[PDB]
């Protein structure tokens, strides 16, 4: 391969960024998969986009990036697929989801379900294999849970579903429904957009929280009825304090484990509420911003005194568990690194500060600026 981007330039100090030699996978350093073909992530230049992961066209050029991850499989059913006319999921049949991103049309965990059906040769569903299924993050049609195995306590398997699109409803109005289950917190930590249709949380009855949500906030339409009905009365709920986390924003929660928060009383850490941040006390490294609680660069050096990060990204931070290099605190100092006008530089290694340049070719490890470097 000829060089992608540029090659170690010595002002930026990060193999940047243009041009030199071109690109290809067609076994020909030119440019660039003309009309025909796309381009791999790894600086190739292929055709048909590397199944995992997808295509994309920033700046009219057809790069092809990483799915991150699950990739996106849209599935269908129940009745039709797949699937085809069939009460709830069962039991069979649930297997037809492994790796469903999001799954057009509705979905019923009805209890003719785990019960098993004979009448149609169908073993009870295993609560286990109901975690199929956290691969799901969207629903075109609607959720409809009237069965749910009662030594569960939330809608766990449904913990990554982000969205209940419109798009069809249980009866001609009603997009999410959770009629009379045994659980105790909805457990819908990733659903914050019910596109359209109505929520009805009927007769749950050990069911705390789930009426602290400001529902309208998730509703992308006009007359969005949320009918919270016959449930665990909020004193029953106050008497345990299945109250939202102390640590939780005024906004809400869905369980009580802080992760179950809606937005945070203090700051957040990457999916779950937190006390305060670690920018000052080590542990993942850490440093605040926008109230999220981002870690530091791997190559930073902590401190009782100082803080360890002025921000995200490698360079800007307080010190260095591997030398330094202009701004850029390098993990391992470059050595044999080509090119730029054909040069495999070739830089190291003065103590206290950064790396200094070598003298021609030297694939061997060369010291000072003077001469005595390469025998």
């Amino acid at each position, epitope marked *: 391969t000829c060089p992608p981007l540029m090659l170690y330039n010595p002002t930026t100090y990060q193999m940047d960024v243009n041009p030199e030699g071109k690109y290809s996978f067609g076994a020909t350093c030119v440019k660039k998969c003309p009309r025909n073909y796309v381009v791999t992530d790894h600086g190739s230049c292929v055709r048909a986009c590397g199944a995992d992961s997808y295509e994309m066209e920033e700046d009219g050029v057809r790069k092809c990036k990483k799915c991150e991850g699950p990739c996106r499989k849209v599935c269908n059913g129940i009745g039709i697929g797949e699937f085809k006319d069939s009460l709830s999921i069962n039991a069979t049949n649930i297997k037809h989801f492994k790796n469903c991103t999001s799954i057009s049309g509705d979905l019923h965990i009805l209890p003719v379900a785990f019960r098993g059906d004979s009448f149609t040769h169908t073993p009870p569903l295993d609560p286990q294999e109901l975690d199929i299924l956290k691969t799901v993050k969207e629903i075109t049609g609607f959720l409809l849970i*009237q069965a749910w195995p009662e030594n569960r306590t939330d809608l766990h398997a449904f913990e990554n579903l982000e969205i209940i699109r419109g798009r069809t409803k249980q009866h001609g109005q009603f997009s999410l429904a959770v009629v*009379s289950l045994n659980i105790t917190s909805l457990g819908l930590r990733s659903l914050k957009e019910i596109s359209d249709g109505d929520v009805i949380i009927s007769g749950n009855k050990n069911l705390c929280y789930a009426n602290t949500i400001n529902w309208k906030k998730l509703f992308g339409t006009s007359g969005q009825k949320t009918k919270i009905i016959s449930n665990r009365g909020e004193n029953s709920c106050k008497a345990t304090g299945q109250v939202c986390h102390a640590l939780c924003s005024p906004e809400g929660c869905w369980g009580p484990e802080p992760r179950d928060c809606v937005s945070c009383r203090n700051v957040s850490r990457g999916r779950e509420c937190v006390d305060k941040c670690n920018l000052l006390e080590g542990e993942p490294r850490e440093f605040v911003e926008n109230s999220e609680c981002i870690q530091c660069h791997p190559e930073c050096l902590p401190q009782a005194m100082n803080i360890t990060c002025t921000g995200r990204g490698p360079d800007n931070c307080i010190q260095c568990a591997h030398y330094i290099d202009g701004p850029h605190c390098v993990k391992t100092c470059p050595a044999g690194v080509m090119g730029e006008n054909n040069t495999l530089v070739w830089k190291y290694a003065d103590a206290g500060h950064v790396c200094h340049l070598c003298h021609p070719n030297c694939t061997y490890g060369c010291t000072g600026p003077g001469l005595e470097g390469c025998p």
Partner: T-cell receptor
Amino acid sequence: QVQLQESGPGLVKPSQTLSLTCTVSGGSISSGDYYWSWIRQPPGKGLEWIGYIYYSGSTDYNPSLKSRVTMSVDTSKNQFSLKVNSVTAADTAVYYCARVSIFGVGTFDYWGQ
Amino acid sequence: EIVMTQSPATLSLSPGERATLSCRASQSVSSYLAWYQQKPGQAPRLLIYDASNRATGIPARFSGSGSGTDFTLTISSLEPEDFAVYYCHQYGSTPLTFGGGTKAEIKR
């Protein structure tokens, strides 16, 4: 079309047990569209709600009634049924069986006789 | 439980005149509330559910009204054939409770 005839014992001896049976004319007890329920009304008074049962376990009964009731559902004769055990002096009343609609009105809409 | 307190017990009124009825719920039943009508010998007849809407069809004169903890039954202009005891009936939080009543008698 639908209707909830209450049926069985006129008299019950105290410390003995009440059981009654409701039933279900023009509709298939076994569907999630309905809680089937019971309320009773001590003669000369307000209604008191007892408990109910969905077409899969899930009963919920009235704490008031102190663990005595349970509900259940013979699907043969397409009905569902009370028992209150430990019936007392103050258990004496009128038991209504009735239907709730979840998706409609969330409420009692058809009571039997 | 979560007490409905219908008031005021007893209301004699006389034809085409406005009748005004009410629970105060002990804690907020949001809107989850329905009104009923026990005419002797039979019983109940749901009339309004949620505040607010009349089932189908109760007579348009039947009206209510209310959210939070205080709601109101307004029979608009009373028949004789409005002789019943009328009932509150919440469904927000188990246990379901009804109110006290109001016996509504019409003066001839």
